[PDB]
Amino acid sequence: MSLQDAEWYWGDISREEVNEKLRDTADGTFLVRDASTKMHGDYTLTLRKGGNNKLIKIFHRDGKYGFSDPLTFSSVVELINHYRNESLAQYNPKLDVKLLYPVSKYQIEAVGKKLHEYNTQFQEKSREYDRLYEEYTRTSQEIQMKRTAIEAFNETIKIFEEQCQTQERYSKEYIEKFKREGNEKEIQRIMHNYDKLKSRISEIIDSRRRLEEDLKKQAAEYREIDKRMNSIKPDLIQLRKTRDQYLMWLTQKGVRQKKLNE
């Protein structure tokens, strides 16, 4: 019945920490804090509505509480119970929502031992992910530079293929003139040079292929590194959530231990 026992009153936790307790939650989820001013008697109700976290000041004036100048509640508990059963539109028609969902506040050497294990697990899986992320970006750098190098090959090959078509054009009428003059030597000179051109171009397309194959295999490793990072990200938040409540649980009876545990 007392405020100190209510599930939805959290004492002097921070504004930043109710932001984390209300993110992506439903309309009507609510907590009550001690005001950020941490002055006696004042509290702040925070409820979610429209994807935002609304801050309602709970005023205190001579042993009674309320949101406005008609303070008509002897306790903060009955103030919250009234609007747990009536819509806040009764106070502000814009806030057509009632306090639907209270955020409840619960859900020695051996816990120090278990905190140490989960922390060890968390830390080395944090190094697991920090390693893939540098390999993910190191692989990303090498890919986009291999991609531009392939577009460089494309441009050189385009420039050389037009060199073949200008050779086959401006040479046709001269080859045809040479052959009926019986000048095989002048024709061989044109073919000697044409064949050298045709040999270098094929050397370049082979170098393009070898890079296309080197890229396609590296772009697959890139996707696979993304796969297993996405598999670690959720397990990593889980491991973090347990150590946080273990460290808080141990803070209630063993501050001296955490001071030396890690």
Binding site: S14, R15, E16, R23, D24, D27, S36, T37, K38, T44, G50, G51, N52, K54, L55, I56, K57, F67, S68, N92, L95, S126, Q144, R147, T148, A149, E151, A152, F153, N154, E155, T156, I159, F160, Q163, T166, Q167, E168, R169, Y170, S171, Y174, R189, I190, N193, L197, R200, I204, A219, R223, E224, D226, K227, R228, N230, S231, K233, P234, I237, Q238
Partner: protein, 992 residues
């Protein structure tokens, strides 16, 4: 390619306009005029030579390592400088204006990407930007040529002045009855020996009056008529200007001499101003003409949003390259939200959950928002998320944001493909509403397909004419209060505004105008998801009283996206923000460009104009943009903006290229050591290092260029013997140049810079900016806590320059100069003995004073900002006695801080005593800290604004506004000044 240096001689294959190809051996250093000429001499040995024209008819084309088909119009360039992908040259006939193409190549080198890649962009907004922004270029170039040459000298060498002439009394009190003694120099011989002329002058003399005294003192014995003397003064005033000895700073404008930063520092540091007399025609002689040629690309039924009687609706179709382990995570789904800045205008809606192997939704999503209620800056923020459980746990895979209105005011319609972005490192939130709007250009990225409703025609946002009508239509439908308004006005930008306070502010929105700085709190009280309230707010903003720049800058962060708010903020800057404070906040003003919805906006046109009319800020405008061009999320916006700058900045592009080229051969050189040649130790790195720096092409590139840390510093020849690679961090380079100034001996002859590569540097720029800020306000409030905000510049991805301070040591190095006392323990008194040895006599009490004051300042700054990891190798002290910190890798205590103060400092503060903390010297040191700490609290707003403008930067220390909460705790802003002192005092005593 993959070739660091070309061999001495190479065989380049030349493709001729006939069919022939010629393998031509040619020297690495050979120029294209040489190559072409010798080619067409060799071409005679091959068939079909008849068809070739004279070599004057042709030029070379080839492909670069950047994949560009470059026309080598500038044939004076060297074969090894071409960045060729392969050694070949295609002979072709030139087409297109030569000057545009030669310029585009040097612009592409400066900004780091081929300009032609902009020509090939589908987006109409990209082509509209680079076309329409050319007017800002023309009017900036026209402006700087009005009153040539003087106007052009003011552009390249702008006065380096404080914001106001009035000296703080702390500084004025050092003057000799309001006067300052200065020495003026003249180079009087061809061999260049110099003559002195010492003057004593009123501190507020303008440079022309200083010239008049110099000529008066020189002619005192010439028995000149009062009229003939004035003819000499008039002559010298109109024929000479004053220069700072040792650097390229000139006194070209009639500011009082005491507000030129160089001389207000001489007054502060009690130094002797050394000025060189210089013929102003010799200065104008070193300012070659430049012109802004208009580029080639500067050439060549609807209904209203408030008549769509329906709710918002968007369709999620499917996604492609999603990378999830089908057997590790259960399903995936698309999260969405309609946002106005960081505030969601309505609750978020998700698609159904679908198997990983089939990202198929084909869902229309319905949003709790009436379309006419959409604010102009509204935007769609989405992400693909994964789910696994056994609690239920979510985490995002990729994200993407979309502006519901494009730059032409029209509402998006029809299908749309959106390539998503990788989730930023260390972000668990499902959506990223502070990231940029745009599609990922990279290939094989997860592409999410959407569809928007089509209302039978194109929909446009209503004209302001219609909005003020609806405002008048909707509006038709005291002492304790003004204390409330003044109280809410006082609170900081990130204070908690309750719902009661919000609609109280809105209820009194017309009485808020009397207190104009209340605007940010009032704007956050508006129901942005209501056409009605927004319409009325536009009317207030239209006639809102301007506010100081440091409060307008708040309205440019990510919480204020509305283009009317931001337009008002920009108009405050372009009317009140001095070029001094603009230059000081430029880092934040360049960052908040990221928050801008569209390419063409009032802020970028403001920053560009001031950058093309003041080359001091235009220099850092370039490097702040260039340093970030690797990031693909902003690569395009900053790229086009850099193009417009380099296309109009004038002859300074030539000097920026020398800097970029020098920094390139420093990152390439340092990469070879830090990444490839990791097997070798320092001594073998040294002999390796010098051989690289012996090369002519390296020496030519690393000598004779302007310092990026301060372009007024010329970097001449290298002192190879003094250069070295340091044994710390990621093995940074210590570089030393000669100062080629005619009078370098009067400032410094050695210019030393540290070049570091491997760790992020824009944490340091911010904290060093902050440190300079809080130093400036201590001085103006009577606290002479001398800080040392040494220069630091991020020039690329985790690479940058650091100004090293002369005659300084880490306290670790100083402990190693002394002896041991305790068992395997350095003597704590070593530091004090070292200051005594280097400050013998009457200058002893000064050094202990400077140490105590500088120490006090850095203790307060580090505690407030949460700089952890403070140890003996990142704490430094000068022979002067001044103390300063280095390496600000962290802040906001980014560890998954105490009030630092060691015994070694206490024994210096207490002049060696044994009862250190009980001495009168220590109680004086505590007073300094308590005063300094309180002074920051009463300026906390602009510090929080400086951090909140950097949220989109990508610095992991501050990814969300919650990260800025650390500074609200250290400053205890939700408490009273008397509770803050006790908190700070306790944090100090709790360390004792």
């Amino acid at each position: 390619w993959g070739i660091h240096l070309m061999p001495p001689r190479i065989l380049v294959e030349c493709l001729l306009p006939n069919g022939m190809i010629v393998t031509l051996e040619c020297l690495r250093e050979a120029t294209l005029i040489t190559i072409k000429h010798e080619l067409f001499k060799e071409a005679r040995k091959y068939p079909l030579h008849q068809l070739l024209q004279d070599e004057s008819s042709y030029i070379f084309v080839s492909v670069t390592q950047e994949a560009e088909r470059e026309e080598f119009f500038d044939e004076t360039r060297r074969l090894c400088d071409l960045r060729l992908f392969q050694p070949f040259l295609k002979v072709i006939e030139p087409v297109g204006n030569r000057e545009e193409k030669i310029l585009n190549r040097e612009i592409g080198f400066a900004i780091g990407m081929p300009v032609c890649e902009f020509d090939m962009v589908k987006d109409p907004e990209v082509q509209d930007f680079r076309r329409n922004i050319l007017n800002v270029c023309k009017e900036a170039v026209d402006l700087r040529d009005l009153n040539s040459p003087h106007s052009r000298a003011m552009y390249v060498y702008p006065p380096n002045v404080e914001s106001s002439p009035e000296l703080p009394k702390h500084i004025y009190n050092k003057l000799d009855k309001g006067q300052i003694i200065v020495v003026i120099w003249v180079i009087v011989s061809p061999n260049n020996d110099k003559q002195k002329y010492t003057l004593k002058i009123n501190h507020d003399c303008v440079p022309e009056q200083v010239i008049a005294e110099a000529i008066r003192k020189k002619t005192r014995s010439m028995l000149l008529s009062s009229e003939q003397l004035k003819l000499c003064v008039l002559e010298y005033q109109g024929k000479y200007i004053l220069k700072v000895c040792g650097c390229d700073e000139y006194f070209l404008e009639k500011y009082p001499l005491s507000q030129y930063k160089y001389i207000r520092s001489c007054i502060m540091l009690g130094r002797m101003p050394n000025l060189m007399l210089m013929a102003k025609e010799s200065l104008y002689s070193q300012l070659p003409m430049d012109c802004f040629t208009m580029p080639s690309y500067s050439r060549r039924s609807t209904k209203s949003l408030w008549v769509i009687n329906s709710a918002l609706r968007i369709k999620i179709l499917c996604a492609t390259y999603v990378n999830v382990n089908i057997r590790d995570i259960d399903k995936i789904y698309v999260r969405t939200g309609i946002y106005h800045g960081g505030e969601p205008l309505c609750d978020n809606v998700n698609t159904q959950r679908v198997p990983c192997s089939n990202p198929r939704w084909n869902e229309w999503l319905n949003y709790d928002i009436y379309i006419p209620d959409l604010p102009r800056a509204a935007r769609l923020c989405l992400s693909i998320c994964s789910v696994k459980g056994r609690k239920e746990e979510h985490c995002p895979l990729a994200w993407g944001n979309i502006n519901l209105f494009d730059y032409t005011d029209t509402l998006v319609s029809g299908k749309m493909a959106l390539n998503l972005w990788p989730v930023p490192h260390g972000l668990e939130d499902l959506l990223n509403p502070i990231g940029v709007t745009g599609s990922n250009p990279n290939k094989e990225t997860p592409c999410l397909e959407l569809e928007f409703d089509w209302f039978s025609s194109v929909v446009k946002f209503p004209d302001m004419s219609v909005i003020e009508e609806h405002a008048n239509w909707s509006v038709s439908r005291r002492e304790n209060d003004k204390e409330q308004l003044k109280a809410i006005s006082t609170r900081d930008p990130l204070s908690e505004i309750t719902e009661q306070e919000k609609d109280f502010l809105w209820s009194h929105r017309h009485y808020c105008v009397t207190i104009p700085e209340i605007l940010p709190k009032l704007l956050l009280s508006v129901k942005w998801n209501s056409r009605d309230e927004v319409a009325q707010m536009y009317c207030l903003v239209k006639d809102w009283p301007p506010i100081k720049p440091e409060q307008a800058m708040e309205l440019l962060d990510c919480n204020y996206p509305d283009p009317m708010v931001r337009g008002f903020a920009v108009r405050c800057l372009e009317k009140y923000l001095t070029d001094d404070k603009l230059s000081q906040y430029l880092i934040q003003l360049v960052q908040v460009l990221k928050y801008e919805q569209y390419l063409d906006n009032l802020l970028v046109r403001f920053l560009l104009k001031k950058a093309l009319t003041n080359q001091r800020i235009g220099h850092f405008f370039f490097w702040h943009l260039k340093s970030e061009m690797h990031n693909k999320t902003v690569s395009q916006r900053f790229g086009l903006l850099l193009e417009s700058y380099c296309r109009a900045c004038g002859m300074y592009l030539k000097h920026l290229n020398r800097q970029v080229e020098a920094m390139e051969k420093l990152i390439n050189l340092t990469d070879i050591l830090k990444q490839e040649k990791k097997d070798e130790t320092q001594k073998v790195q040294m002999k390796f290092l010098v051989e690289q720096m012996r090369r002519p092409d390296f020496m030519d590139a690393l000598q004779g260029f302007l310092s990026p840390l301060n372009p007024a510093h010329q970097l001449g020849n290298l002192r190879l013997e003094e250069c070295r690679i340091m044994s710390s961090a990621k093995r940074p380079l210590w570089l030393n140049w000669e100062n080629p100034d005619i009078m370098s001996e009067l400032l410094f002859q050695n210019n030393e810079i540290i070049f570091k590569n491997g760790d992020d540097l824009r944490q340091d720029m911010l904290t060093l900016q902050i440190i300079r800020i809080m130093e400036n306000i201590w001085q103006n409030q009577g606290l002479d806590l001398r800080m040392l905000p040494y220069g630091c510049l991020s020039i690329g991805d985790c690479v940058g320059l650091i100004e090293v301070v002369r005659n300084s040591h880490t306290i670790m190095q100083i402990q190693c100069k002394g002896g041991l006392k305790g068992a395997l323990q350095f003597n704590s008194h070593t530091l004090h003995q070292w200051l005594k040895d280097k400050n013998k006599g009457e200058i002893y009490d000064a050094a202990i004073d400077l140490f105590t004051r500088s120490c006090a300042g850095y203790c307060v700054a580090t505690f407030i900002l949460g700089i952890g990891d403070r140890h003996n190798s990142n704490i430094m002290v000068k022979d002067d006695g001044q103390l300063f910190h280095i390496d600000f890798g962290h802040f906001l205590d980014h560890k998954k801080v105490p009030f630092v103060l060691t015994q070694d400092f206490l024994i210096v503060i207490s002049k060696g005593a044994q009862e250190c903390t009980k001495t009168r010297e220590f109680e004086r040191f505590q007073e300094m800290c308590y005063k300094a700490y309180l002074a920051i609290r009463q300026h906390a707003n602009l510090f929080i604004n400086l951090f909140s403008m950097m949220l989109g930067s990508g610095m992991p220390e501050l990814q969300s506004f919650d990260d800025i909460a650390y500074i609200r705790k250290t400053l205890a802003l939700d408490k009273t000044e008397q509770e803050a002192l006790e908190y700070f005092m306790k944090q100090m005593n709790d360390a004792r």
